[PDB]
Structures are given as C-alpha cells and as structure tokens.
Scaffold this active site. Structure first.
Site, mmCIF file in Angstrom:
data_model
loop_
_atom_site.group_PDB
_atom_site.id
_atom_site.type_symbol
_atom_site.label_atom_id
_atom_site.label_comp_id
_atom_site.label_asym_id
_atom_site.label_seq_id
_atom_site.Cartn_x
_atom_site.Cartn_y
_atom_site.Cartn_z
ATOM 1 N N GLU A 43 73.166 38.656 52.034
ATOM 2 C CA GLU A 43 73.749 39.700 52.863
ATOM 3 C C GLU A 43 73.743 41.024 52.127
ATOM 4 O OE1 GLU A 43 77.474 38.499 54.709
ATOM 5 O OE2 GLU A 43 76.990 36.391 54.341
ATOM 6 N N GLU A 89 79.526 45.091 62.602
ATOM 7 C CA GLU A 89 80.654 44.180 62.610
ATOM 8 C C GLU A 89 81.905 44.970 62.276
ATOM 9 O OE1 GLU A 89 80.385 40.938 59.934
ATOM 10 O OE2 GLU A 89 82.479 40.335 60.162
#
Ligand SMILES: *[C@@H]1O[C@H](CO)[C@@H](O[C@@H]2O[C@H](CO)[C@@H](O[C@@H]3O[C@H](CO)[C@@H](O)[C@H](O)[C@@H]3O)[C@H](O)[C@H]2NC(C)=O)[C@H](O)[C@H]1NC(C)=O
Ligand SMILES: *[C@@H]1O[C@H](CO[C@@H]2O[C@@H](C)[C@@H](O)[C@@H](O)[C@@H]2O)[C@@H](O)[C@H](O)[C@H]1NC(C)=O
Ligand SMILES: [Cl-]
Ligand SMILES: [Cl-]
Length: 256
Positions: free
Chosen positions: A57, A166
């Site tokens: 990530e 997000e």
C-alpha cells in the site's frame, strides 16, 4: 465500519500481476473530527484473502492522530495476515526496507489548488522476479522494497489492484454524515483541477507487459454515493479515475 470509499478494483484470474502504477492528484482534504479522522488516496496491491490477505500500500494521507498535522503526507502500509497481527505504517515496524532516502517516508506533499496548480504523487510498484521483493519508486526514483520474506501469498505476484480514496470517520456516522473531505472535497463531475484524480491506472501482466485496463475492467466501490463518489473520464491519452467529495451534512431530521 466507519470507513467510506470511492475506489475501483482490478481483479486478475490469478496472483500473477507483476506491479502497478498510480499517479495520485495531491490535495489537503479537511477533516471534521481531527481527533481520530483521516482521509487518504492510495493504491492497494493484494493477493490472498481472509487471514492470508497480503497487501502492498502506498499513497498520501491526512491523518493528524498519526502524523501530528493536517498536511497530506506520503505513507506506506502492508499486511501479511489481513490486518490481524502483522503490518504497520511507514517504518514504524520491521517490514519495508528503505534503500534510498532521497525521499522521506512520511514527507509532506504539496497540495493542489482549486482551479489552479495541480500536484501529483507518482508511485510505481514493481516485483523483482528473482526474489519476490516488491520495489517502490516515486517520480521515477527508488525508495526501497517490501521484502518477499514478510509475505506468504503475494511473493509470486498479485491478483488484485485497487486505487482511490478513503476516509475514516471517527465520529460514528459511518462516514455517511460527516463533512470530512475525500480527495479535493469536490465531487468527480467537477473534473480536472477541481476534483481529485488517479491516473496511470496500469498493471504489469503475467507476460511482463504494461497494461492500462479499460474502464469496464474495474469494479467500482462507493457505499456512500451522496457523500463520496467516483467517475471514470476515459480520455484518448489515458483513463482517469475522478473520485472524492465533500461528504454529507448532518441534515437528517426523521421522526415518526
Ligand atoms: C508504470 O509501470 C511500469 C511497469 O513497472 C514502469 O516501467 C518500468 O520502469 C522501470 C523503472 O523506471 C524500468 O526499470 C529499468 O529497466 C531497465 C531494463 O530495460 C533496467 O536496465 C534499468 O536499470 C531499470 O531498472 C522498467 O524497465 C519498466 N518496465 C516496463 C515493463 O516498462 C513505469 O515506470 C511506470 N510509470 C509510471 C509513470 O509510474
Ligand atoms: C496466471 O494465469 C495466466 C492466464 O490467466 C488468464 O489470462 C490472463 C491474460 C488474464 O485474462 C487472467 O485473468 C486469466 O486468468 C497464465 O498464463 C499464467 O501462467 C498464470 N500464472 C501462474 C503462476 O500460474
Ligand atoms: Cl478478503
Ligand atoms: Cl458525481
């Protein structure tokens, strides 16, 4: 959950993808509840599922409770067991190996200007086929790698890549009634310069070629679409994921 998303997902038949890119428009979204809120845009490269989910990530995050300010900062994350017992941000736990400190993990990034100057975070993640190590480059410069040795299911390649935005809503509205911003805080229909985008939506296939999927190749995720949304803008040059939004105001007034 108290997370909301405007994310697209690319699923491959097997865990043989060899890398992916993401060029992420940089913004400084505002958080309604800085005590625990955060807002981010990132790539997720994963294989496996459940307790064998492995992730790679990288992106930018505004997370005051972690970083000590409200600036967009470059971050990395990983896990090798589906976020149960392994993984961590940045260099806070043994994990990612930084080989080049030209760029600092955690560095503050320059935010784009509404209707003005735009800034991008270009990240390229590439599996080394001799080791299984996953190498990270920023704007073409090496940073380091996630070693295969911390992983179990992603060592040979990945089966899924996801991109987009997000927010974590620490106020307990489920991300459904918080003015915490995603991306630029503007809905994707506003387009370039006003809504945040991800471009260079590219993967490296099993045969080693760089492939830019077409829009129909993506599964979209936006579980609070009046608050945060995505829109594809397939140009002739490349595919754009425009994403984000201002969040929803607490305007509900229900009574029996
Ligand atoms: C998008 O992703 C692709 C695929 O990973 C990136 O292309 C790759 O870029 C790396 C490093 O920039 C190239 O590595 C170089 O390869 C030569 C051999 O040709 C080697 O001798 C050098 O020392 C160096 O390691 C790699 O060749 C290249 N791979 C492919 C398949 O093209 C690209 O940089 C990414 N673009 C963006 C904008 O993120
Ligand atoms: C992984 O699968 C490859 C072929 O899979 C299919 O073809 C590609 C082009 C995609 O459409 C994918 O979604 C499909 O499942 C094989 O050629 C390759 O050898 C496989 N890799 C391993 C390690 O078995
Ligand atoms: Cl899963
Ligand atoms: Cl929209």
């Amino acid at each position: 959950t108290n997370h909301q998303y405007a994310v697209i997902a690319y699923f491959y038949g097997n865990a043989s993808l060899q890398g992916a890119n993401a060029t992420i428009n940089i913004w400084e979204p505002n958080l309604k509840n800085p005590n625990g809120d955060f807002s981010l845009t990132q790539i997720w490269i994963s294989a496996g599922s459940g307790s064998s989910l492995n992730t790679i990530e990288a992106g930018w995050q505004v997370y005051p409770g972690r970083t000590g300010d409200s600036q967009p900062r470059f971050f990395i994350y990983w896990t090798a067991d589906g976020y149960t017992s392994t993984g961590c941000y940045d260099l806070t736990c043994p994990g990612f190996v930084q080989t080049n400190n030209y760029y600092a993990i955690g560095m503050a990034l320059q935010p784009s200007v509404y209707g003005g100057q735009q800034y991008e975070l270009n990240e390229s993640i590439q599996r080394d086929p001799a080791t299984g190590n996953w190498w990270l480059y920023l704007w073409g410069t090496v940073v380091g790698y996630w070693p295969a040795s911390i992983y179990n299911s992603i060592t040979n390649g990945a089966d899924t890549v996801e991109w987009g935005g997000e927010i974590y809503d620490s106020s307990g509205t489920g991300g459904f009634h918080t003015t915490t911003q995603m991306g630029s805080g503007h809905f994707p229909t506003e387009g370039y310069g006003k809504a945040s985008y991800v471009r260079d939506l590219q993967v490296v296939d099993t045969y080693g070629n760089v492939i830019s999927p077409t829009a129909n190749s993506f599964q979209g995720i936006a579980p609070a679409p009046n608050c945060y949304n995505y829109q594809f803008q397939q140009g002739s040059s490349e595919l754009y994921l425009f994403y984000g939004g201002p969040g929803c105001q607490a305007i509900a007034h229900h009574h029996h």
